[PDB]
Amino acid sequence: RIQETQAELPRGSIPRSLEVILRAEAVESAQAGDKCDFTGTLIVVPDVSKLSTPGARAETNSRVSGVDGYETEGIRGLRALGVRDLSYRLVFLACCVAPTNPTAESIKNQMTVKEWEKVFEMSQDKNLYHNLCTSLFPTIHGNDEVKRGVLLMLFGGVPKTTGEGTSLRGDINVCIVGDPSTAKSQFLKHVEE
Amino acid sequence: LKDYALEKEKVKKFLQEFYQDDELGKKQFKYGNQLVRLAHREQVALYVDLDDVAEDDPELVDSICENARRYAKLFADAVQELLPQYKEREVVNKDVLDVYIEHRLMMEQRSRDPGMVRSPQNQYPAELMRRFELYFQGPSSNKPRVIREVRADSVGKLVTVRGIVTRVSEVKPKMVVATYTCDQCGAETYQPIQSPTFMPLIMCPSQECQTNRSGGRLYLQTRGSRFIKFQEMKMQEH
Ligand SMILES: Nc1ncnc2c1ncn2[C@@H]1O[C@H](COP(=O)(O)OP(=O)(O)O)[C@@H](O)[C@H]1O
Ligand SMILES: [Mg+2]
Ligand SMILES: [Zn+2]
């Protein structure tokens, strides 16, 4: 199942939902929560309980009439002429699925030479501690402690397990309490973006 | 049991008779004026008082009370037969339904010779051409009943009730007679409705389709159909 994104919403409208079908190799990809582009076809599939009122329907061209004792009444007449209700729904078949915007060895191999050059340039800078604070939060004034804490939470720690069957946390949790208008929701919005 | 022809004649003479009551202090032909208005589209329903009938014949009133539906139908037919007599002019302004009725009567006169044999199925339904409704007013001598005490003994009778309204349904059209057109002929088929649900037809009973054995198939039409105003009411005791 896929959903229309927020940027495509018109005034006062709920996002549209659509069904996508994957066949064979393309079945693997497109996990839940992703934001992806699809390329394929738009195809019509029949439906059953759409018509509570009579609508378009099919029949046979043969000019056949009933005989006494076998008169083409309701049920028998409909079954004899092969009448089917024409109901339909729209379904999308996908042949290509891609990310809208795109195991350490695998990550290293995926990156190109220029991307790896940029990564290495970033790696050996002490100002990485400072510049990352200003880059993610350019407009918010002060509160550098909160920026450092949020960056540390983003990078996170290492999880471990012990021999007795217990487990140890590797994640970090952060709480912010403040007076009104102290840019408290701006950090949340920036991290969401 | 009594034959319906005699009572139909009695109904006709009762409708033709009364001169008595007038509001302005005179003697006025009330039912004649009502019928003249009914001739054109200046009145689309008629109410009959069962107190006025009681002057000449009470047995008619009792039979109406116990067998109300049959007498309603008889009254409708009697008034429909009386309508041509009182007619004096053609319609000044008419709507779609009148256009169908006039056209159908005109082609009936065009085609049907007086001597040719006509099948009982070949006639028009009575209520399709009719456009007036008849209703009854409860007798003043009759005492209104209570919702709790109407039971199987009262099924089919004429009753008068007093109550409080709690639920009313929005107005929606109700089917009276359905009209069908064949796929390969100019004939028209009529299906009366007297059930909460009905099954639409398929094949054409028209004579030409039968003679050719063409197997033409019917289609519904909404313009030719007859519809009535229908509402549902809920009442409770005081
Ligand atoms: N230190 C700051 N630097 C820049 N803008 C700020 C700062 N403090 C407050 N603001 C502005 O004031 C508003 C604060 O509202 P908000 O952060 O939603 O308050 P709260 O999160 O406490 O409900 C924001 O729109 C922000 O633009
Ligand atoms: Mg806030
Ligand atoms: Zn036909």
From Swiss-Prot, chain A:
Where on the tree of life does the source sit, at the highest rank? Eukaryota
Q: Could you say which protein family the record assigns here?
A: Belongs to the MCM family.
- Name the UniProt record assigns to this protein: DNA replication licensing factor MCM6
Look up and give the organism this protein is from: Homo sapiens
Q: Which residues of the full protein are shown?
A: 207 to 411 of 821
Where is the PTM Phosphoserine found along the chain?
Answer: S13, S65
PTM annotation (Phosphothreonine): residues? T72
Q: Describe the PTM.
A: O-glycosylated (O-GlcNAcylated), in a cell cycle-dependent manner.
Q: What else is known?
A: Early fractionation of eukaryotic MCM proteins yielded a variety of dimeric, trimeric and tetrameric complexes with unclear biological significance. Specifically a MCM467 subcomplex is shown to have in vitro helicase activity which is inhibited by the MCM2 subunit. The MCM2-7 hexamer is the proposed physiological active complex.
Curated annotation (Swiss-Prot), chain B:
Q: Where is this cross-link: Glycyl lysine isopeptide (Lys-Gly) (interchain with G-Cter in SUMO2)?
A: K13, K26
Record flagged with keyword Repeat: no
Extract the GO molecular function terms from the UniProt entry. Answer: ATP binding; ATP hydrolysis activity; DNA helicase activity; single-stranded DNA binding
Per the UniProt entry, what are the Gene Ontology biological process annotations, in alphabetical order? cell population proliferation; cellular response to epidermal growth factor stimulus; cellular response to xenobiotic stimulus; DNA damage response; DNA replication; DNA replication initiation; DNA strand elongation involved in DNA replication; double-strand break repair via break-induced replication
Q: Which GO terms describe its cellular component?
A: chromatin; chromosome, telomeric region; CMG complex; MCM complex; membrane; nucleoplasm; nucleus
Keyword terms of this UniProt record: Acetylation, ATP-binding, Cell cycle, Chromosome, DNA replication, DNA-binding, Glycoprotein, Helicase, Hydrolase, Isopeptide bond, Nucleotide-binding, Nucleus, Phosphoprotein, Ubl conjugation
The known PTMs are summarized as: O-glycosylated (O-GlcNAcylated), in a cell cycle-dependent manner. Ubiquitinated by ECS(LRR1) E3 ubiquitin-protein ligase complex when forks converge following formation of DNA interstrand cross-links. During mitosis, ubiquitinated by TRAIP when forks converge following formation of DNA interstrand cross-links. Short ubiquitin chains on MCM7 promote recruitment of DNA glycosylase NEIL3. If the interstrand cross-link cannot be cleaved by NEIL3, the ubiquitin chains continue to grow on MCM7, promoting the unloading of the CMG helicase complex by the VCP/p97 ATPase.
Q: How does it assemble?
A: Component of the MCM2-7 complex. The complex forms a toroidal hexameric ring with the proposed subunit order MCM2-MCM6-MCM4-MCM7-MCM3-MCM5. Component of the CMG helicase complex, a hexameric ring of related MCM2-7 subunits stabilized by CDC45 and the tetrameric GINS complex. Interacts with the ATR-ATRIP complex and with RAD17. Interacts with TIPIN. Interacts with MCMBP. Interacts with ANKRD17. Component of the replisome complex composed of at least DONSON, MCM2, MCM7, PCNA and TICRR.
Q: Which family does it belong to?
A: Belongs to the MCM family.
Q: What does this protein do?
A: Acts as a component of the MCM2-7 complex (MCM complex) which is the replicative helicase essential for 'once per cell cycle' DNA replication initiation and elongation in eukaryotic cells. Core component of CDC45-MCM-GINS (CMG) helicase, the molecular machine that unwinds template DNA during replication, and around which the replisome is built.
Further details from the record: Early fractionation of eukaryotic MCM proteins yielded a variety of dimeric, trimeric and tetrameric complexes with unclear biological significance. Specifically a MCM467 subcomplex is shown to have in vitro helicase activity which is inhibited by the MCM2 subunit. The MCM2-7 hexamer is the proposed physiological active complex.
Task: Name it.
Answer: DNA replication licensing factor MCM7
Gene, per the UniProt record? MCM7
